[PDB]
C-alpha cells in the first residue's frame, strides 16, 4: 500500500517474514517498496528480491504451460465445440505474467541498473533483465516476439561482456548468467550450437579454476556447474 512512508528496514523485515510464510506475492511487494526507497541493495537483499519475483513468475509460468498444452491439445482434436474457454483463461494468466515481468523490468530500469556501484551487482541486474525478457519471450508471438528476444540478448550480452572482464569464471553470478544465457540460446533463440558451445566453455573454465573457489560460494557454483552438465547431457 503506502510503502513510500515505511521504514526501509521494516520493509526488509516483512519481506523475510513473507518468505518464511511462503507468501511470495507479499514478499515481492515488500521488496519493490524497499527498492523504491532509493538505496542500493545488499547481497542478501538482492537474493530476497530475486527469490520473491522468481517464485511469483515461476507459478505463473507453470500455470501458463499447463493451459497452453491443454489449448493446443484441444485445437488439434479440432472438435466443433471446444477451445474458447481455455484460450481465454490462458490469455488471462498470460496477461498477469506479463504484468509481473513488466514490474520487474521497470524496477531494473528505474532504480537498480543505473545506480549499481560495482561490477558484480551490475552483472546481477543485467542478468535479471535478460531473464525477465526471456520469460516475456516464452509467451510472445509474432513481431513483438522478435523485439523481446533482441532485448533479452542485448541484456545478456552486456552482462557477459562485463563478467568476463571483471569477475572470476567461478563467480556464482557469472555462472548463473552463463547458464541462463545458454538456456536462452537453446529454448528461445533456436541456436543449439551456441547454447552447447557456451555451456561447454563455461563448465570447462569453471572446473579449471575450481581449486581457487572460496568455501563460501563453493556450494552455489558447483550447483550451477551441475546444471550446465545436465543441460549438456540433455542437448547432446
Amino acid at each position: 500500500g503506502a510503502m513510500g512512508s515505511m521504514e526501509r528496514a521494516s520493509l526488509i523485515q516483512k519481506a523475510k517474514l513473507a518468505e518464511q510464510a511462503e507468501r511470495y506475492e507479499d514478499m515481492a511487494a515488500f521488496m519493490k517498496g524497499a527498492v523504491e526507497k532509493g538505496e542500493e541493495l545488499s547481497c542478501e537483499e538482492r537474493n530476497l528480491l530475486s527469490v520473491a519475483y522468481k517464485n511469483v513468475v515461476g507459478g505463473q509460468r507453470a500455470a501458463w504451460r499447463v493451459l497452453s498444452s491443454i489449448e493446443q491439445k484441444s485445437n488439434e482434436e479440432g472438435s466443433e465445440e471446444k477451445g474458447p474457454e481455455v484460450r481465454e483463461y490462458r490469455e488471462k494468466v498470460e496477461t498477469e505474467l506479463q504484468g509481473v515481468c513488466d514490474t520487474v523490468l521497470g524496477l531494473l530500469d528505474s532504480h537498480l541498473i543505473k545506480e549499481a556501484g560495482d561490477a558484480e551487482s551490475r552483472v546481477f541486474y543485467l542478468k535479471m533483465k535478460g531473464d525477465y525478457y526471456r520469460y516475456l519471450a516464452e509467451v510472445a508471438t509474432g513481431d513483438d516476439k522478435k523485439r523481446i528476444i533482441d532485448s533479452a540478448r542485448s541484456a545478456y550480452q552486456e552482462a557477459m561482456d562485463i563478467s568476463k572482464k571483471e569477475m572470476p569464471p567461478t563467480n556464482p553470478i557469472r555462472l548463473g548468467l552463463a547458464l541462463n544465457f545458454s538456456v536462452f540460446h537453446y529454448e528461445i533463440a533456436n541456436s543449439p550450437e551456441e547454447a552447447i558451445s557456451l555451456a561447454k566453455t563455461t563448465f570447462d573454465e569453471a572446473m579449471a579454476d575450481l581449486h581457487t573457489l572460496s568455501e563460501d560460494s563453493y556450494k552455489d557454483s558447483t550447483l550451477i556447474m551441475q546444471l550446465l552438465r545436465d543441460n549438456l547431457t540433455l542437448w547432446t
Binding site: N47, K54, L179, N180, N231
Partner: peptide
C-alpha cells in the same frame, strides 16, 4: 523436458 536455469537459493 525443458532446460534447467539457475534456481533459487537461500
Amino acid at each position: 523436458d525443458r532446460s534447467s536455469s539457475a534456481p533459487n537459493v537461500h
